[PDB]
Design goal:
Strand order of the largest sheet of chain A: 2-1-5-4-3
InterPro entries (chain A): Sig_transdc_resp-reg_C-effctor (IPR016032), TF_LuxR_autoind-bd_dom (IPR005143), TF_LuxR_autoind-bd_dom_sf (IPR036693), Tscrpt_reg_LuxR_C (IPR000792), WH-like_DNA-bd_sf (IPR036388)
Shape of chain A: elongated
Oligomer: homodimer
Pfam family, one (chain A): GerE
Structural class of chain A: alpha+beta
Radius of gyration of chain A: 21 Å
CATH class of the largest domain in chain A: Alpha Beta
Bound molecules: N-[(3S)-2-oxooxolan-3-yl]dodecanamide
CATH architecture of the largest domain in chain A: 2-Layer Sandwich
GO molecular function (chain A): DNA binding
Largest interface: A-B, 41 and 39 residues
Number of helices of chain A: 10
Helix content of chain A: 40-55%
Domain HTH luxR-type (chain A): 165-230
Protein name (chain A): LuxR family transcriptional regulator
CATH topology of the largest domain in chain A: Beta-Lactamase
CATH superfamily of the largest domain in chain A: Transcription factor LuxR-like, autoinducer-binding domain
């Protein structure tokens, strides 16, 4: 783990970030990497920011085809919170996606999902075109890959969050925080005032402050953001 | 060593199995006490904790009767920070009465790993002893395994206790149900959702009412928050 904390603090661009993960990739016996985060909202159109060194033709195909929508590594890494070893030849769904992925050497993968601050979900994926991932290779590397990815997640977070989730800077008062907690379970302004023995006018006022902080147009949208960011906790 | 464990874990089916397996890691890594637990994501307003420990029973009842999950800074660290915490009770100047009582029971030198898991669960392993501070060489010696085993314990603990502490986690939602809840998550009205999908208000409302039941919620906001927190909207 030595030196990595030092390099992750001197990183200021994605090009420096890209270079770090590339060396982690090579120093650990793999051909390709991808690293990215899903921004937690808007929920209707979820936006991914990732880097990779895959063949450039695969990168354009992957982007044009919107292959995050179908990629089982992405679709499963959103619901499983633990590392996953994969082999592209094992998948019988999306066989077209996997055929041209295998065509590019994207065959034996190791994917490490982490949840981080601000509702970011990040994944490190290390891939190579040949040589199965040993069971002995797992124990030798699993602890460091797990550890480095939770460091990368933080740096990739610190780097991109103020743009890829702007509301990451929002801080709510205690009063604001409670208004949104009750608005989360669907309470009206009046029900909250009753519960907390304050006026409906005051309840509005606090929710309206928090909506604006959260660049939201109604309180149901603001509420879902505050939860997703971790502001309700 | 960790290979023995993935087998022991792939076969656990009871909380007493879990309890004794975590009691064994505590002793084999030099600690007097342990706690492992998870925070259910619902209800947001008063979310429930389910944990195990071997603390003095005088401390277990006291932690519950006083509702200490709400001021315990070790818990509060795990919810807000995604990093592990090495702690020494006597260092804390806030919530003094809490720490006097806990230091009275020898819950003094601790190491707490928080991990996020399925269904919006948040879990934490803590190991404690009454003496010998946790020094930076001991950290390096045992850090890798502790973070590793915590991610393993939470999977198994979530497997075990999810049906009870978040019973909505088994809910499956229709394609249509999923997307009426995604549009409700930004506060669109039934009519607004209708015009977006070019369907009738009442068919929007039917999907929402059916998801509300499945999610055991009494309004579409509560159900959307539950669906979101569990992972059904992704
Ligand atoms: C699940 C956690 C969310 C993190 C988002 C990261 C975005 C990463 C996109 C690329 C992932 C990735 O490398 N997919 C592989 C599968 C076969 O060919 C590929 O290209
Ligand atoms: C990640 C946050 C939620 C996880 C829920 C875990 C519940 C465990 C509660 C007990 C934690 C715990 O052991 N706290 C120590 C610190 C002072 O004396 C104590 O009792």
């Amino acid at each position: 783990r030595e030196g990595y904390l030092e390099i992750l603090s001197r990183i200021t661009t994605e090009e420096e970030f890209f270079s770090l993960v590339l060396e982690i990739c090579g120093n650990y016996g793999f051909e390709f990497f991808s690293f990215g985060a899903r921004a937690p909202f808007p929920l209707t159109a979820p936006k991914y920011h990732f880097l990779s060194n895959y063949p450039g033709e695969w990168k354009s195909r992957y982007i044009s085809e919107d292959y995050t929508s179908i990629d089982p590594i992405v679709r499963h890494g959103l619901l499983e919170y633990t590392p996953l070893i994969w082999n592209g030849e094992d998948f019988q769904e999306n066989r077209f996606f996997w055929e041209e992925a295998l065509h590019h050497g994207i065959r034996h993968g190791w994917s490490i999902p982490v949840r981080g601050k601000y509702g970011l979900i990040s994944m490190l994926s290390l891939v190579r075109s040949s040589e199965s991932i040993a069971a002995t290779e797992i124990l030798e590397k699993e602890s460091f890959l797990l550890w480095i990815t939770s460091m990368l997640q933080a740096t990739f977070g610190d780097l991109l969050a103020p743009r890829i989730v702007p509301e990451s800077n929002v801080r709510l008062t205690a009063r604001e925080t409670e208004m949104l907690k009750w608005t989360a379970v669907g309470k009206t302004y009046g029900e909250i005032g009753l519960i907390l023995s304050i006026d409906q006018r005051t309840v509005k006022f606090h929710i309206v402050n928090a909506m604006r902080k959260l660049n939201s147009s109604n309180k149901a949208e603001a509420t879902m953001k505050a939860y997703a960011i971790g502001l309700l906790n």
